[PDB]
Design a protein around this ligand. Structure first.
Ligand SMILES: OC[C@H]1O[C@@H](O)[C@@H](O)[C@@H](O)[C@@H]1O
Ligand SMILES: OC[C@H]1O[C@H](O)[C@@H](O)[C@@H](O)[C@@H]1O
Ligand SMILES: OC[C@H]1O[C@H](O)[C@@H](O)[C@@H](O)[C@@H]1O
Ligand SMILES: OC[C@H]1O[C@H](O)[C@@H](O)[C@@H](O)[C@@H]1O
Ligand SMILES: OC[C@H]1O[C@H](O)[C@@H](O)[C@@H](O)[C@@H]1O
Lengths: 106, 107
């Protein structure tokens, strides 16, 4: 609506509106939380070019924009079944899967 | 323990250790997943400074280091109670707290 209570958030595409639809606060896919007043953008968080996933009115009192949790490193073994990571006594760190070792440190 | 099975994770400060007690794989506070043999680092993911907060062995078969959700903008009003954000008909964007306006746009 026009209000975000504690624990509520705007996700990408979500919005608040007021002034008979003339005013729109919206979290964009470029990452920016923007307030559009009619034709013009009157204010933003300046978070364009950043991977902002939500604008949460937190229960601790703080309204906060967060970038998404992202992967930064992987074994690159998506698709493998029943996997387990084992730190072995031969010092090798091995990712095992249904049809044998999918990834190996050594 | 020496094993993480499908869906498990090391969290910050969490460790795997080999059965013999000689090798220790630790997701550290600095984000680096480090393998120690004794007190000498023999391998790491080199993710120090990259905000990694967990390393989960996923059900899809992929072992992945994930970052935390990073705060990139805020109103700086931690401590305020019963807060709500209101986009008003006068065009103002106001964060209202128990004791009054904690933050506003038009000021
Ligand atoms: O980079 C790791 C990413 O790659 C994918 O193929 C999936 O397994 C995701 O869950 C993961 O976040
Ligand atoms: O000032 C707000 C303005 O910032 C950038 O230029 C872009 O993200 C626009 O989408 C947005 O309207
Ligand atoms: O490639 C994985 C393979 O590497 C080595 O040969 C050993 O550490 C084995 O335990 C492991 O299965
Ligand atoms: O830097 C933003 C940060 O401010 C505080 O420490 C808390 O309200 C956190 O939840 C929030 O992420
Ligand atoms: O500073 C916040 C305060 O600013 C203006 O005076 C008005 O828009 C009020 O509705 C709002 O509460």
């Amino acid at each position: 609506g026009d209000t975000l209570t504690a624990g509520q958030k705007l996700e990408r595409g979500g919005s608040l509106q007021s002034g008979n639809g003339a005013y729109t606060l919206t979290l964009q896919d470029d990452g920016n939380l923007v307030l559009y007043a009619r034709d013009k953008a009157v204010w933003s968080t300046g978070t364009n070019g950043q991977d902002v996933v939500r604008a949460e009115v937190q229960t601790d009192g703080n309204f906060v924009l967060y970038t998404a949790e992202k992967p930064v490193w992987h074994t690159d073994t998506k698709g493998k079944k029943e996997v387990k990571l084992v730190l072995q006594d031969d010092r090798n760190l091995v990712l095992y899967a249904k049809d044998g070792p999918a990834w190996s440190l050594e």
